[PDB]
C-alpha cells in the first residue's frame, strides 16, 4: 500500500503536533479552546524536561472546567510559551499561531503513524454528536 500526502497531526486528546526541521510543537485544537472557554491558568513544565509518550506534562484551568494535557510523543522540551505566562487568553484568538502549549523534538516519529491525521480527525470530531 501507499499513502498520499500528510500534514498537521492530531491525537485522541484534541492535541495537535506539527513537524518541521525535526521539531514537534505541542498544542490544542480550536475545538478544545471553544469548549474549555476563557483560560485563566496554565500549568506548564520547565524547558529541559524529559517527557514520555502519553505522559502528564501540564494542565489547564478555565472559568468553566479543567482539562488534563498529555504529550504526543517522548522527547525533550526545547522551549515553552512565554506569552501565556502573562496573557494565556491568546490561546483563544490564536490556537497554533502563538497559542503553542510547548515545543519539543521528535525522538520516535514512527508513532505519529498510529495517530489520526487532519482527515481522520474529522471522523473523530464529527462522531462527537453522531
Distance (Å, rounded) from C-alpha 119 to C-alpha 26? 19
Of 29, 9, 4, the closest CA to residue 128 belongs to 29
Tell me how the structure was determined.
NMR
Q: Is 120 helix (H, G, I), strand (E, B) or coil?
A: helix
The residue to which cell 505541542 is assigned = 26
Per-domain boundaries in the chain: 1-130
Cβ partners under 8 Å of residue 23, min gap 6: 78, 103, 104, 105, 106
CATH of domain 1-130: 2.40.50.100
CB 29 within 8 A of CB 95: yes
Amino acid at each position: 500500500g501507499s499513502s498520499g500526502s500528510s500534514g498537521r497531526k492530531f491525537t485522541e486528546k484534541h492535541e495537535w503536533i506539527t513537524t518541521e526541521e525535526g521539531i514537534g510543537t505541542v498544542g490544542i485544537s480550536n475545538f478544545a479552546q471553544e469548549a474549555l472557554g476563557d483560560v485563566v491558568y496554565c500549568s506548564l513544565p520547565e524547558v529541559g524536561t524529559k517527557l514520555k509518550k502519553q505522559e502528564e506534562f501540564g494542565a489547564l484551568e478555565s472559568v468553566k472546567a479543567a482539562s488534563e494535557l498529555y504529550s504526543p510523543l517522548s522527547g525533550e522540551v526545547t522551549e515553552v510559551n512565554e506569552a501565556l505566562a502573562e496573557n494565556p487568553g491568546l490561546v483563544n484568538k490564536s490556537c497554533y499561531e502563538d497559542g503553542w502549549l510547548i515545543k519539543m523534538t521528535l525522538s520516535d516519529p514512527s508513532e505519529l503513524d498510529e495517530l489520526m491525521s487532519e482527515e481522520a480527525y474529522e471522523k473523530y470530531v464529527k462522531s462527537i454528536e453522531e
